């Protein structure tokens, strides 16, 4: 490639965690999406635990 790959400048952990969390909160806003994804995670850890990390 011929473009400068922008590396992470190592932002602080607190503010970066807060930023990513608020962004996720914006994405999955209603209880139904969250319930779907949480049920998926539960079913994965019941069955799909091991084939993917």
């Amino acid at each position: 490639p011929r473009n400068p790959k922008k590396s992470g400048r190592a932002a602080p952990r607190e503010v970066r965690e807060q930023f990513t969390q608020a962004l996720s909160d914006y994405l999955m806003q209603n209880p139904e999406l969250k319930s779907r994804v949480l049920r998926g995670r539960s079913e994965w850890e019941k069955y799909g635990a091991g084939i993917i990390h």
Binding site: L27, M28, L33
Partner: protein, 106 residues
């Protein structure tokens, strides 16, 4: 054999020449063809003599058939349409911020 130059002029000239144009509406919708207000909106009377009734019918039927589809009522479609416009390009976040500030919200 025609020149292929990128024409250039000052931004304050583009904004003052283009954005001053206004429509030239020679046969407006009569004032007696609008019902009373419903919030911020008035409705075309069904007995209008204008040509806007076919426009109204087309958009009305389109809206009804769009909203009737059960796909537009799951959280996935809602979320896709939400995230459609959340890009890495500018959106004038300043004036948003300083307009939210004017009502004492952080």
């Amino acid at each position: 054999c025609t020149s292929g130059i990128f024409l250039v002029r000052t931004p304050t000239e583009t904004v003052l020449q283009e954005y001053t144009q206004s429509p030239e509406i020679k046969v407006p919708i009569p004032q007696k063809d609008w019902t009373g207000p419903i919030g911020e909106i008035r409705i075309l009377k069904d007995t209008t003599s204008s040509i806007a009734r076919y426009l109204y019918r087309t958009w009305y039927l389109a809206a009804a058939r769009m909203a009737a589809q059960p796909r537009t009522w799951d959280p996935l479609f809602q979320a896709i349409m939400r995230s459609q416009y959340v890009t890495a390009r500018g959106g004038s976040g300043a004036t948003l911020r300083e307009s939210l500030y004017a009502i004492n919200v952080s």
